[PDB]
Amino acid sequence: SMIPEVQKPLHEQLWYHGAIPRAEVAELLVHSGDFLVRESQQEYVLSVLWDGLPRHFIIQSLDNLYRLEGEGFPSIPLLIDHLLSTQQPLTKKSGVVLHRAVPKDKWVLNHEDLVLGEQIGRGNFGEVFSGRLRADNTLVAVKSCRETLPPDLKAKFLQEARILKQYSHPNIVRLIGVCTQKQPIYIVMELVQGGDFLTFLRTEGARLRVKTLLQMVGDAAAGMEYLESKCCIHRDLAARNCLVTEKNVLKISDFGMSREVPVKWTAPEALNYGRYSSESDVWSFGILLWETFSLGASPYPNLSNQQTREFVEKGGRLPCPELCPDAVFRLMEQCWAYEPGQRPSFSTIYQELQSIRKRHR
């Protein structure tokens, strides 16, 4: 007891995907004749899979009527339902016939489902805002994609959402939703209330006893053990990409680079040969441990990026921070073993941090 679906506004249609990039359309259509409707970079486009490729048709509008090449209709849903029913080729020259509408997935949210609050910085692709779900005031982080990035990079942006949809762990930041209906597109995450771990160490560091710091890097080890168990390589592990909850729990984030430039956190073999692995993540973990005990000082402050590569390639490593227990430094040195196979696992790291922590008041 509602109204016919075809009488609902375009923007309510399940097969209307809004501002999804042309690139992303290829990931959503499976079988011949799958289609969806979307906005273009601005008129409307009917994207339909044909011979394994998306084909894109401009829906024209003249004197309030929508059409491809024939009979015009008062709305896009009416046009869609007519093309679907008559099994008409969309245009003669293409010969393409619609077969099934592909709905938005369970994660898509409308822009109006969010209330933006204060800007909280910038990530690799745009501003990030604190905000709330309008429905229930749940606190969220809204990561925006700068509307003038290359449509090729709206892909690397939406890739973090694709990954996170499949992950669930107490030390990994949780995805809430994806706002791809309007520009600018947003990825919506739980708001981790204490901010990023770098600013935390720099602002709150004086209060963080060794026992506490060990609990927080223990959390980062548990998160990374989880990613290792999913064959997920983070590639950008650093304090700036860890977040701190209001109860001091650490969560790993920033899965844009992740896969199933920050030279100073990156393993030699990853820089030299492009070989990224969970072993190169353990290298980055050693650097994170250094940041942790240096109250967020920057690593290798005497060295350019290039000098860091060269320094490391002749056996240079970071020195032991004043606050860093000797046992933690010995662990860090294992994490930065030149031979990647000689580095400890995340399980081993977690175990040794937990053990060291019982020796601190």
Ligand SMILES: COc1cc(N2CCC(N3CCN(C)CC3)CC2)ccc1Nc1ncc(Cl)c(Nc2ccccc2S(=O)(=O)C(C)C)n1
């Ligand atoms: C309240 O929650 C947060 C506050 C801050 N800060 C950082 C320092 C900043 N001060 C403010 C003014 N001061 C004068 C100096 C600096 C205030 C707010 C930073 C991050 C969060 N929370 C948060 N949760 C989830 C995500 Cl998902 C995320 N993501 C997120 C947030 C901000 C930037 C980048 C990302 S990110 O996703 O690209 C990745 C780096 C975590 N950020």
